[model samples]
Target: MKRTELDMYDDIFAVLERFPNVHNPHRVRIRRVGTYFIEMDIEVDGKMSVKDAHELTVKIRKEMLKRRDDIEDVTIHVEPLGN
Candidate 1:
C-alpha cells in the first residue's frame, strides 16, 4: 500500500470540515510509525472547557479512525485562537 502525506492531509481537512467548533487547527502532522500505522497531531480551540475538550478529542479521533484504517492514532493540542 502507498499513501503520501498529501493524501493524509486531504483526508484530514475533509474530516475537519465536519467539526464546526474546532477552530484554528495550526497543524495536521501525520507521521508513519511502523508499517501500516499512522499517527497524527492537530490543534483545536482553547475556549472550550476541559470536559468539552476531552469529548471533542474523543469524537475527532474516533471519526478519523473510522474514516481511515491507516490512521492509527490522533493527538490533539488545544490553544486559544489567534487574531
Candidate 2:
C-alpha cells in the first residue's frame, strides 16, 4: 500500500523489526522516494563492500516476504560511521 511521509517511520520500523540480528534500529535511516519505494541506510560495525550491503538487504527482503506485501523492493546503502 502507498504511504504518506507521516507513515514512513512506522513502515521503516516494521521492515527493520524483521531482522533483529542484522539490524540496529538506532543506526538505520529511511528515505521515501515518492510513493514507489523506500531507501534504507544501515550503519555497519566495520567496513563493508557494496556486495555485503546488498546481501544484508536481500536478507531483510526475504524476511519481509513473509510479513508485508507493501515492500516491493529493498536496497541497502551502507555508510561507515566510525572505526
Candidate 3:
C-alpha cells in the first residue's frame, strides 16, 4: 500500500516534468474520492498570457488523465511566482 502511493506521485511528477512552462511548481496534492477516483490540486507560477494559462489547465488535465485512469478530476490554482 505504501509503495503504491509512492508510485502514483512519480507518475504525476513525470507528467509535470515534461511541461515546457510549468516552473517551480509547489503544493501538489492528490486525494482519493470514494474507491477508485482521484482528485488532484496543483499550483504553478502564474506569469503567462491568459490563453497560455488556459492551455496549462487543459494540458494538465489531459496528461494526468492519460497517465492514470483513476484521476477523475483535476483542479489547478495559479498564483504569482513570488507570492
Candidate 4:
C-alpha cells in the first residue's frame, strides 16, 4: 500500500512517538522538507560515545525509512543535548 504525502507525516510521527529519547531533557524533532524528505533531529546524552551515536543513526534511518515510501530521503542528526 502506497501512502500519499499527507499520509506519510502522521505515520512517521506515530512511529517516533513510541520511541522516546533515552536521554531526558531532550527530544526528536521531525519535519518534512516540502514533500521531498523527512528531516529528523534527535537529542541524546552528551556523555554518550560516538560509537553509540553512530549506531543510533543507522537504526534510526532503518526504522524511519521503512514506514513510508512517498518520501525519498530520511536525514537524521543525532546531537547532544545542550542542557
Candidate 5:
C-alpha cells in the first residue's frame, strides 16, 4: 500500500478503539496486499453489537478512500467469538 493509504489504517484503528462496549482484547488487524488492497480483520468480544461492527467497517472504508489510488478496496471481516 502507498504511504498515504497505509496511514489511513491508523485512523481506522483509532476509530475502532472508540467503539462503545468493545472489550480490551478486541483488535483490528491489517494486512496489505500489494498496493491496491487491504484486508482488515476486526475481532471483538461476542457481546458487541452488530450495528457497531458495521458502522466501524463503514468508517474504515471512508478513511481508506481519502487516499484513493493507494487503496482500491478494503475488505473488513468481523470476527466474533462464540460463547
Candidate 6:
C-alpha cells in the first residue's frame, strides 16, 4: 500500500524525535521520490563539529532507513542551527 504523505510525516517525525540531535523536532520538510526515496533537510546545532555532526548524521540516517525496508533512499541536508 502506498503511504500517504501525512502517514510519512507521522512516521518521519517519530523517527527524528527519538534521535538526540534533533533538538527542535517540529522544524522539518520532506520530499519523496517514487515509493522509497525521501528527501529531508535535517537541522543540527551550529556548535556541533563536522566530525561529530557527520557521525551523528550517519546514526540518524541509519534509523530512518531501518525504520522500514520500504524506505530505500534517504537524502538529507543538515542545516547548521545558528543560521
| Per-model RMSD to reference | 3.2, 4.8, 2.5, 5.2, 4.9, 3.2
Q: Is candidate 3 or candidate 4 better by lDDT?
A: 3
> Ten consecutive residues with minimal summed lDDT in candidate 2?
27-36
lDDT of 4: 0.64
Candidate 5: which stretches are off by over 4 Å?
A: 1-35, 81-83
lDDT of 1 by residue, 1-83 (tens): 25776787778778877888876665556667764343444455665688887898789888988998887778877666662
Least accurate 10 contiguous residues by lDDT in model 3 = 35-44
Candidates in order, TM-scores: namely 0.78, 0.53, 0.78, 0.63, 0.52, 0.75
The whole-model lDDT of each prediction reads 0.71, 0.59, 0.72, 0.64, 0.62, 0.72
The RMSD (Cα, Å) of candidate 6 is 3.2
Q: What digit string (tens of lDDT, one per residue) describes model 5 on residues 1-83? A: 67965576566556546655433333344555675566656567676688877887787677666645566777777777441
Please write out the lDDT profile of model 4 over residues 1-83, one tens digit for every residue: 33654466667666666565533322333454555566766678888898988877677667777776655677667767764
lDDT, candidate 3, 16-75, per-residue tens = 888867766666677777743434444455656777788887888799889988777777
Cα error, candidate 2, residue 44 (Å): 0.6
Q: Which window of 10 residues has the lowest lDDT sum in candidate 6?
A: 24-33
Residue 10, candidate 3: Cα error in Å is: 0.8
**lDDT tens readout by residue for model 6, 16-38:** 88887765544455555565676
Question: Model 5 scores what on Cα lDDT?
Answer: 0.62
Tell me how far candidate 1 lies from the true structure as C-alpha RMSD in angstroms.
3.2
**Residue 68: error of model 5 in Å?**
5.2
